[PDB]
Amino acid sequence: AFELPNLPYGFRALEPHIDQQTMEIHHDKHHNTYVTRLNAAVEGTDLESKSIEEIVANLDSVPENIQTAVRNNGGGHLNHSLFWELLTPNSEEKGTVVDKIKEQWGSLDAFKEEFANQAEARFGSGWAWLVVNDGKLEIVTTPNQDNPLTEGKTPILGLDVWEHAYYLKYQNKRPDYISAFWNVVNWEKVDELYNAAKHH
């Protein structure tokens, strides 16, 4: 019952910051595999009528024998679903969260530096996040497909630092990928996620 969402732009739309080949394989193979395996895990359980956000927020209540499959593949589905919507060929560094970041870090650039440092320091596979914890902004990273929702922090920006997300264009140069990412951040979607969670 979970479905692979179409990208909200073309595979080529994020060039030259993220290559078309990566956008295609990352979406049509990696994300698709998470959807297939999530559906196999939840099929015939009462997870199958729940939102992915409810499942990932409540992984501790997922039946023991499927909890790892749901953590990994449910996490994969939520994280990539967020990621596609958080990218745009028309990125503008403005809006409510940019203003909150400038207030807290003193500048957007100082925030980008801390986010880049944490994203680079995430050893192995995982994600770098800006989260809202009970109205407050924090940078965190997670391993594999873990999502801050599970820890009661609402993600409003995420960067995939699995090597599949950057290896074809950047190989070992994760810092260059992180630098490229700023050019395609959908700050409108960041604002939408923040606004939804500041009053929830």
DSSP-derived secondary structure for 95-126: SHHHHHHHHHHSSHHHHHHHHHHHHHH--SSE
Spell out, one character per residue from 132 to 161, where the chain touches a second copy: x when CB under 8 A holds, - when not: -----------xxx----------------
d(CA 77, CA 3): 9
Burial of 192 (0-12, 13-18, 19+ CB in 10 A): middle
Q: Which residue shows structure tokens 């030259």?
A: 16
Among 6, 65, 90, 172, binds a second copy (CB under 8 A): 172
DSSP 128: E
How far apart are alpha carbons 30 and 35 in whole angstroms? 9
CB of 80 to Mn ion, least distance (A): 6
Rounded Cα gap, residues 132 and 71, in angstroms: 21
Shortest distance (Å) from residue 95 CB to a second copy = 33
Give me the least distance between CB of 31 and a second copy, in Å please. Answer: 11
Q: Pick one of 2, 129, 162, 181: the residue that binds a second copy (CB under 8 A).
A: 162
- Residue 162 is a binding residue for Mn ion (CB under 5 A): yes
Q: Are 161 and 126 in contact (CB under 8 A)?
A: yes
Q: Among 90-98, 149-157, 159-167, 186-194, which window interacts with Mn ion (CB under 5 A)?
A: 159-167
Which is closer to a second copy, CB of 6 or CB of 172? 172
Would you tell me which residues interact with Mn ion (CB under 5 A)? Answer: 160, 162, 165
Would you tell me which residues interact with a second copy (CB under 8 A)? Answer: 21, 25, 29-30, 33, 72, 123-126, 143-145, 162-164, 167-168, 171-172
